[PDB]
Each structure stands twice: as structure tokens, then as C-alpha cells.
Design a protein around this ligand. Structure first.
Ligand SMILES: Nc1nc2c(ncn2[C@@H]2O[C@H](COP(=O)(O)OP(=O)(O)O)[C@@H](O)[C@H]2O)c(=O)[nH]1
Lengths: 316, 35
């Protein structure tokens, strides 16, 4: 009846989004009053996003389509600094709209695989008309899209199909060997999140293998560690929507030079599924439970988490 | 294994900071190319 769940996976893989989804699906979710509280973080996320892109234009030596935008860009830092946390002025709105629309800013945005741009950037910046209004109320999806900093381990608890779930997301905060051992102790299932769309990210300077291969190295280690014999290993191949949009223009050979298949969603996604499941060295004993997911899609998470729950039940 | 902890700490830390939470003073330092 008591079920301990550990979310693992790279930063930006979708862990805290899943946590939020469990709140929406299996807890009370977000009321309109709570949603109003996320307004400031929506604005900051939006501004961080366009700033991140402006910075990359500098590093990447991409010029603005129209040179007037440079003053907008200069102004953005002043106006964002003038603050009023939770409120966007007509002038800030204007500055951001004209930046997001600039052909150079767009050129840089399309080159996001060369730098680190969060996946909520397009979502907010494409919704500027709705968002910038002084009467704007964040929808549940807006809230789901928010990016907050956190203090260490996160835990939500909920009851589903008569089970007490404790879902732990350790997150990007560095933890000592002892904290991990405590986390691993008494674990029913591990959900390993993978950002599919990370396949085309440029190698960092100190990095020997690409993000996907590091994710694979970690998963090999978790999945084959004898301590997890009776632990249900669940693999979420996440950001499938973003993967489907990318696979057309960025070949999977960026990530897997040996890939000989086509660049259809179907063949390239299957290929990644095999790369992961083939790391299982105890194939006859151990079964990976793999789902392709869009963590920001509430329906999909609900469906997938339903199948996962049936798996944990049956494993008795 | 200690090998697993190395991987975990490395792999789970990665990605996009400076793009989380409320606006902070450091996030708003003008880019050099705009000076
Ligand atoms: N389009 C899309 N965005 C996603 C998906 N999963 C997560 N995101 C976004 O990617 C970013 C990283 O998600 P997050 O839950 O914080 O990953 P975490 O670092 O492991 O906690 C956020 O901006 C999310 O909105 C997905 O399946 N599709």
C-alpha cells in the first residue's frame, strides 16, 4: 500500500513538471487564486528567455534584423530592472514584442541547440498578446510552464487506486553519498526522465560525450545495479513533441553518428528506445517499462501514469 | 556504488540556470556587445 517513487534524470528532463502534473491529476491542482500568484514568475521567465537569446546573439555574433532593436535590447535591461514584480508596462511589452519579432532574434532562437535556452521560452513569448495585458490571469498551463528555483528534495504525496504514493524529485541540487543512499532506501519504482529533444545539443567545452550519452550512462548504471532487483524501472522518453518538430531539420546523426535510418519521428524515436533498453544486461529477469511522453501534456501524463500504476500493482 | 553518485550529481545538475525563478540583479547585467 505504501509506494516510494524516485524521479531521476538530467536537469531540464521534465522531473518537476511531472511533479506538478501529479498535483493537477491526483491532488487539488491550482485554483484561480493560486494561479494569480504565479504572475510574477511568468513575467520573469519571459524576460529571462528573451535575455538569454540576446546574450547568445552577442556570443554568436548574430546581428539584429533592424538596428533599432539594439536600443530596444538596451532598454529591456532598464525596464526589467525598473521592476514592479508582477506587472508589465506598455513600454516593456512593446520592447519584448519587437525583439521577439526581430529577424535576427529569430535567427538566434532557431540556433538554440548552440546555447542553453529553456523550453518554456517559445511558449510564453508566442503568447505575449494574452500575457502582457494588465488583466492577465495565468491559466493552469501557464502555471505548469513556470520555472522556479527550489531548496533541495521535493516531495508530493497523493493517494491513487488505494495506494499511498511518495514521489521524490532530488533535482539539480548536489547531494552527498548519504542523502542518495537514504533516497534509494525503500524505493518501489524509479522513473527515469530523458529529454528526447536533447539529441542535437552542442557538446559543452569540458564534455567528452553528449547529453544523451550521459543520460544513457546513468541509466545503464541505475538499471543494472543489483540493489534495484525488485525496483520497477520506468523510462520516460520525454519531450516527444519537441523531438518530432526537430527531427525534420536536425539529423539524429548529430547524437548517434552510426544511425542509418530515416529522419522520420517513428524510426528515430524507436532507435533511441533501443539504445536505452539495450543497456539492460539482465534482459531475462528485468523489464524496462518505457513510455513516450510530453510532460507538459496533462492528458498524456494521466494516461501514462495510469499504466505505470497498474504495473506497480501487478508487481506484488 | 560511488560511481552512481558521481554520475547522478553531474547528470542531474546540468541545463539552464539564470532562467529560473524571479528576476535577480545578476540576470540584468548588460551584455558587452550592447555597450
Ligand atoms: N514542449 C515540452 N516542454 C517540456 C516537456 N517536459 C518539460 N518541458 C519544459 O522543459 C523545461 C524543463 O522541465 P522541468 O520539469 O523543470 O525539468 P527538470 O529540470 O528535470 O525538473 C520546462 O520549461 C518545461 O516546461 C515536454 O514534454 N514538452
Amino acid at each position: 500500500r505504501e509506494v516510494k517513487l524516485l524521479l531521476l534524470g538530467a536537469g531540464e528532463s521534465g522531473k518537476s513538471t511531472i511533479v506538478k502534473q501529479m498535483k493537477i491529476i491526483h491532488e487539488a491542482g491550482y485554483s484561480e487564486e493560486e494561479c494569480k500568484q504565479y504572475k510574477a514568475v511568468v513575467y520573469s521567465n519571459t524576460i529571462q528567455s528573451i535575455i538569454a537569446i540576446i546574450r547568445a546573439m552577442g556570443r554568436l555574433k548574430i546581428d539584429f534584423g533592424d538596428s533599432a532593436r539594439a536600443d530596444d535590447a538596451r532598454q529591456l535591461f532598464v525596464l526589467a530592472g525598473a521592476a514592479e514584480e508582477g506587472f508589465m508596462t506598455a513600454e516593456l511589452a512593446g520592447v519584448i514584442k519587437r525583439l521577439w519579432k526581430d529577424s535576427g532574434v529569430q535567427a538566434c532562437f532557431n540556433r538554440s541547440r548552440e546555447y542553453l535556452l529553456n523550453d518554456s521560452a517559445a511558449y510564453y513569448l508566442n503568447d505575449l498578446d494574452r500575457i502582457a495585458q494588465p488583466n492577465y490571469i495565468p491559466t493552469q498551463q501557464d502555471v505548469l510552464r513556470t520555472r522556479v528555483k527550489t531548496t533541495g528534495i521535493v516531495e508530493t504525496h497523493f493517494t491513487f487506486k488505494d495506494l499511498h504514493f511518495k514521489m521524490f524529485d532530488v533535482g539539480g541540487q548536489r547531494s552527498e553519498r548519504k542523502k542518495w543512499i537514504h533516497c534509494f532506501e525503500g524505493v518501489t519504482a524509479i522513473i527515469f526522465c530523458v529529454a528526447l529533444s536533447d539529441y542535437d545539443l552542442v557538446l559543452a567545452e569540458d564534455e567528452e560525450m553528449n547529453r544523451m550519452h550521459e543520460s544513457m550512462k546513468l541509466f545503464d548504471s541505475i538499471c543494472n545495479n543489483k540493489w534495484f532487483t525488485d525496483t520497477s524501472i520506468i523510462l520516460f522518453l520525454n519531450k516527444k513533441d519537441l523531438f518530432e518538430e526537430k527531427i525534420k531539420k536536425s539529423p539524429l546523426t548529430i547524437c548517434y553518428p552510426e544511425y542509418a535510418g530515416s529522419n522520420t519521428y517513428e524510426e528515430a524515436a524507436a532507435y533511441i528506445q533501443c539504445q536505452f533498453e539495450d543497456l539492460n544486461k539482465r534482459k531475462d529477469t528485468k523489464e524496462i517499462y518505457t513510455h513516450f511522453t510530453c510532460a507538459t501534456d496533462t492528458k498524456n501524463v494521466q494516461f501514462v501514469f495510469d499504466a505505470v500504476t497498474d504495473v506497480i500493482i501487478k508487481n506484488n | 556504488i560511488e560511481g552512481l553518485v558521481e554520475l547522478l550529481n553531474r547528470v542531474q545538475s546540468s541545463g539552464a540556470h539564470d532562467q529560473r525563478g524571479l528576476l535577480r540583479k545578476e540576470d540584468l547585467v548588460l551584455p558587452e556587445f550592447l555597450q
